[PDB]
């Protein structure tokens, strides 16, 4: 797990670690990278997989999401493809606009992972799987040692 | 660490996920990459009758401690026993 | 920390809640307190273009290690990684 210390140096007695509040985790969205955010291109980056547990990490600070996605899809028989939203998971707090998804029909598995390899942010809980009914934004988590 | 067992296995075959190789090559994107049972690496440790056939008695002697610790605590799934031991060790010497 | 990413975004509007001074005024009691989404401090960096998308490049760099670490461990919600970082840091510095 690469570190970030403060110029930005990836990690020395020069850089101290004075107190525990110095450590931070930041959920930067892919919007800065310049990725398209329209619905049909975005839907391509998510793929349905079976056999991998859903892993969740905690990030403390985030960035305003210009677009966050709220996915609600149904298997053709009517069963919900996404797993039920677990406890302590709420939508990403600072969306400007929400791109709700009505449905994608067939669902090949239960968990939907991000093909590019970015977490789904939620509210201070970045996760590798897409949960149902909660507004999420795509993004990746970095670790810093603040002044 | 006296071996009080009736019979002790002189060799050990350990599977372990903490190798950082894991899906060496392969992939690391969760959408791609191995299943839930493909992460593990494995090795054959039969170095000596000191470590092996002694670890088993160490487990016999530490099971009581672990049971008392679990009966004391109220957290259903414990993952910070090793962290707590590390903190105890590090903080013991630098008590001030 | 050189960015190979196509786009560098110098603007970083950041919300956070670790400040502990998010609810100055209002109340701290949970009954009369604010909403669940009104406990956030908002700001913007305006430090450097190279620092913000420098953080973005760092996040690309560290996503692989984070994915490997999450695949290795079995705990669903790993809330304690900063504690791990502090232990590793101070233990390699002053350990033993």
């Amino acid at each position: 797990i690469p570190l970030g210390v403060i110029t930005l140096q990836v990690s020395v007695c020069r850089d101290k670690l004075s107190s525990t509040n110095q450590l931070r985790s930041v959920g930067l969205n892919l919007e800065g990278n310049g990725v398209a955010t329209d619905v049909p291109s975005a839907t391509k980056r998510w793929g349905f997989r079976s056999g991998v547990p859903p892993k969740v990490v905690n990030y403390e600070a985030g960035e305003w999401a210009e677009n966050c996605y709220n996915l609600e899809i149904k298997k053709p028989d009517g069963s919900e493809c996404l797993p039920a939203a677990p406890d302590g998971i709420r939508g990403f707090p600072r969306c400007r606009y929400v791109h709700k998804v009505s449905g994608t029909g067939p669902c090949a598995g239960d968990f939907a992972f991000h093909k590019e390899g970015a977490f789904f942010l939620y509210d201070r809980l970045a996760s590798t799987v897409i949960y149902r009914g909660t507004t999420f934004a795509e993004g990746v988590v970095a670790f810093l040692i603040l002044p | 660490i006296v071996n009080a067992q009736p019979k002790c296995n002189p060799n050990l075959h350990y599977w372990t996920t903490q190798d950082e190789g894991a899906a060496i090559g392969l992939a690391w994107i969760p959408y791609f990459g191995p299943a839930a049972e493909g992460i593990y690496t494995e090795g054959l440790m039969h170095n000596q009758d000191g470590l092996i056939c002694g670890l088993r008695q160490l487990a016999n002697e530490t099971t009581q401690a672990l049971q008392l610790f679990l009966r004391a605590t109220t957290e259903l799934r414990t993952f910070s026993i090793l962290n707590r031991k590390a903190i105890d060790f590090l903080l013991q010497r630098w008590g001030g | 920390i050189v960015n190979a990413q196509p786009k560098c975004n110098p603007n970083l509007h950041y919300w956070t809640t670790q400040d502990e001074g998010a609810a100055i005024g209002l109340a701290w009691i949970p009954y009369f307190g604010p909403a669940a989404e009104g406990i956030y401090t908002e700001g913007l960096m305006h430090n450097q273009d190279g620092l913000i998308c420098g953080l973005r490049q760092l996040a690309n760099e560290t996503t692989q290690a984070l994915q490997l670490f999450l695949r290795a461990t079995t705990e669903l919600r790993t809330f304690s990684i900063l504690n791990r970082k502090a232990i590793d840091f101070l233990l390699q510095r002053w350990g033993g």
């Epitope: 690469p2 | 060496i24 | 692989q64």
Partner: single-chain antibody, 226 residues
């Protein structure tokens, strides 16, 4: 993007050969480098894999373990491979790839360098030299199914243009790599893997190799000359 490696060297057995694969144009730590050995006319054999990211981790083939070690240095961003106890058969050309640590995306870029001293796969039609303008098909078969839970077949196909490095044509089931003419296409059903060239061209001369990326070692097929 461009990759280079050490020029051809000559040595006698009972000693060590040391080679390098210099990189440029990409995030060095991001991509795994696969070393591959090509005996003249014997196809390709996967020497090993190294991912420079973080603490370096190296995996070697079980057939050549304890006789090889590759290590990366990030100052000049170069990977060095060392072989010891060089048998007579070891005389072969050496290649270094740039596979993406993210997902199996083939080996788009390769090197050029030689020296002088499981899931078995088969290529049923040995060689099909045909007059240009005729559609042709090549078949690869594996003992164990290459279907993956995500639904993508990790099969890869490469072209060994005469006296050059392997060239990546079809990656990850049926997708097409950029820089490849659209005449190349294929179908992966998970047990047998077929490639349909629409019309053989004069540039299509050479031997085609099939690759499995599902499990290490990354075995290669015999290859078919078309």
């Amino acid at each position: 993007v461009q990759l280079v490696q050490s020029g051809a060297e000559v040595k006698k057995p009972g000693a060590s050969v040391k080679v390098s694969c210099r990189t440029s144009g990409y995030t060095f730590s991001s991509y795994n480098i696969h070393w591959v050995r090509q005996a003249p006319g014997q196809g390709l054999e996967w020497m090993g894999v190294i991912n420079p990211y973080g603490r370096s981790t190296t995996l070697y083939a079980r057939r050549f373990r304890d006789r090889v070690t590759m290590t990366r240095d990030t100052s000049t961003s170069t990977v060095y491979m060392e072989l010891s106890s060089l048998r007579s058969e070891d005389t072969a050309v050496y290649f270094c790839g740039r596979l993406y640590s993210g997902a199996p995306y083939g080996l788009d870029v390769w090197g050029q360098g030689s020296t002088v001293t499981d899931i078995v796969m088969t290529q049923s039609p040995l060689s099909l030299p045909v007059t240009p303008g005729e559609p042709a098909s090549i078949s690869c078969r594996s003992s164990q199914s290459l279907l993956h839970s995500n639904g993508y077949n990790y099969v890869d196909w490469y072209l060994q243009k005469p006296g050059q490095s392997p060239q990546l044509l079809i990656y990850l089931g049926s997708s097409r790599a950029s820089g490849v003419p659209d005449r190349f296409s294929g179908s992966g059903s998970g047990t047998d893997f077929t490639l349909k060239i629409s019309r053989v061209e004069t540039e299509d001369v050479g031997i085609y190799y099939c690759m499995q990326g599902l499990q290490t070692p990354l075995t290669f097929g015999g290859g078919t000359k078309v």
